[PDB]
Design a binder for these strands. Structure first.
Lengths: 26, 54, 177, 177, 177, 177, 177
DNA sequence: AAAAA
DNA sequence: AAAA
């Protein structure tokens, strides 16, 4: 009954990477 | 260790560093619907239940 | 557990100050403890002095004539007590008059009310349905609680009495709504 | 909070005037306080004088034969009290006769009723289901409240008793409807 | 207002005649006031004479074995009273035997029941769920109300007791249906 | 049978230790037994000594100002008892002050509460709706249970009192959910 | 009418045999009448002898740790009575210990319970919600009914007490299903 | 592969 | 060469 404003917390990522924790993290 | 080798342009098998082999990953979101109360006290409140097939 | 959001006799949000007075029970001229006011009321007494006589006393409200509907619900809650046993019982009363009354008319209608009475303490939280249209045009209907006894015992009484007329309903906070 | 719009023993809109009389309890000829009338009734007493005897007394109504249905609900509300302890108990009664009765027939059926009894004050607001079709053709069924004691104590009693037969239902004002 | 069409302990449509008898309370041989009969029963007493002893007395019904279902509901309503204080309490009882019993077996199960007890008057309208399948094959289960006291006081008792087994349900007239 | 998952006065999960103190009832300066704390509280007493005077005593909580809503439900459960009869009655109280109070203000509002009172034992499990917005800006509203008597009897009292404010609800295990 | 298939304190299907014992009330070492057992229990007493002292006695069960859920409902039903007045009151108790206890720990939590108390007879059918997770790891939580008095009177008591923990629900026969 | 399909 |  409500797709966009109930699924996810932000928009789609089309740009540079933001987070670097030292490797893969899942 | 496998990240250091990857920066040089090489690669390591999963037997080199003794790591498990990933076969498949699945990602989905779970949704549902709402149920309405119909008695004197709960007329106007709702309860949500989540049921998603995958 | 869940809350019970359902009750009888929703009470007024403000109460009258505690007072003291002396009355004499009467059969045809039962006195009224306070001046009747519109719809709900709640009052408490520090010392209510009753003389030895036969009859009753009443606490009365004035019925609201707006929202034309013959059948309406009236509720009551009272914890009257004392130091001795005065040998009394209680019931609801309905009567009407053309002016503001200080007593009860000789003719009236009684409605059964179920409470508790151990020795001289009376507690009740009951309600009933009473007609509100006047029988004779130009009159105002009055409803209240009457304490009746065939032979009163001289003594003093204290407690609290509250009357409500269900013409509207009160909303409350329900955290799950 | 919300109002409870649900109750037992909806009461008649008019009540009989308060009276006084003297009765003698009987086992096979239990007296009736007033002339039975159709369906509901409510009455109050200023002084009911009971002599020392064994048996019971009853307040009786006449069952409405219209709206053919064998099983119907009967309700009661009464706050009987006095100055002394008379050592009595109460229950519902069913009996039938071919004419208007002044007493109760020797054979009758009793239905348990749960109330309150501290010393000599009895209060109850219970109800029960009773068959209405007569056992013998040409008779009229009677239902009421009976006060029974194996050994009555001489004294005087006062209170109010109300009986109702649920053949129809009463509507009231619900502000949210 | 609306009628409450919901109640505990629907009562039998016919009652046994009032009787009088004398019993002696026992701990291992508690007597039975009447011959047990199938499913519901209701009885009243004019004078029940109890001697000074220790133990209990019971009014018993026989469980209906048809409609195979282990868990069933049993209800009770009783207004026992008297002239003096006999210092007793009550609870439900379950026991079984291979023949029609005149007393209660030494081994039995008790179920708590919540009523009212002012001085010597007991009133209750409670109900409970009890297993109905016999523990030993070839026996019949019995359920009833037992009055127990560690030291009875010599005296006489009067009242009415009713027991019901909920194997079926009773329909009543609902005017709005 | 099914469980009733619905009740009045859900109780706090922790209780204060039992204490003993002596108080003097007052009409305009009614003392407070303990320091008021936010929302719910429950306390028990081993010996509460009351001197001969006129007035009342109260157990008070402080209303939570968050979750802005004028009308909210307050509940109470208390089993106060003693060795003698102190001739008192109880009701809910509402008052406000600009600082943490040790007594009750001369002006307050009373709300009827229906319980049980046999000789000197008081038991109640009632609830009511009370406004929470202060009448004068900069004050804090206080709600509690007050025991009032026109003439106290010197003696000692013991029991337990619990107060709750319904700002949120408590969940419990329902096996069928 | 219809059956009420909804009740508080569903009772165990088997009860312990009636016993007799003597206890001494204590404030910090309140004795336990029987060895605690898992979840529900019901017991009856023929003569419980209480000496003159100050403190309380308790009947305790052991909380079932399976079906991990912090909040659960506990119910109680008890009809304790006697020949004299012992001047006591009752409430629920929660405490925990690392071993099987014979007494109650000095520190415990009390939960208000609303019943009836005329002279020395106590009847109650209430229930409450209590947390079940232990505060200190490696302990077992215990819940029961405690009778407390600031000054006990020497005497003997008799009655029946039943405790239940709502971890599962019981089904019953509904003829209309 | 958190970010409507 | 980086959005590694």
């Amino acid at each position: 009954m409500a797709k966009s404003y109930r699924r996810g917390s932000s928009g789609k990522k089309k740009g540079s990477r933001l987070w670097y924790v030292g490797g893969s993290q899942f | 260790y496998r990240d250091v080798i990857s920066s040089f342009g090489g690669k390591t098998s999963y037997d080199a560093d003794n790591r498990p082999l990933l076969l498949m990953r699945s990602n989905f979101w779970a949704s549902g619907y709402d149920v309405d109360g119909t008695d004197q006290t709960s007329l106007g409140q709702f309860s949500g239940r989540v049921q998603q097939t995958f | 557990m869940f809350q019970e959001f359902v009750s009888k006799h929703n009470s007024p949000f403000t109460s009258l100050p505690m007072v003291s007075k002396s009355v004499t029970p009467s059969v045809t001229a039962a006195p009224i403890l306070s001046t009747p006011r519109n719809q709900q009321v709640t009052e408490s007494f520090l010392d209510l002095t009753i003389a030895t006589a036969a009859g009753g006393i009443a606490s009365i409200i004035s019925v609201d004539p707006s929202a034309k509907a013959d059948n309406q619900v009236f509720s009551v809650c009272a914890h009257l007590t004392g130091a001795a046993d005065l040998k009394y019982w209680a019931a609801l009363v309905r009567f009407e008059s053309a002016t503001v009354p200080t007593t009860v008319t000789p003719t009236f209608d009684l409605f059964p009310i179920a409470g508790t009475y151990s020795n001289g303490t009376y507690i009740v939280k009951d309600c009933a349905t009473i007609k509100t249209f006047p029988n004779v045009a130009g009159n105002t209907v009055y409803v209240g609680l009457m304490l009746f006894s065939n032979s009163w015992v001289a003594g003093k009484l204290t407690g609290i009495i509250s009357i409500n007329q269900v013409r509207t309903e009160i909303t409350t906070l329900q955290p799950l709504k």
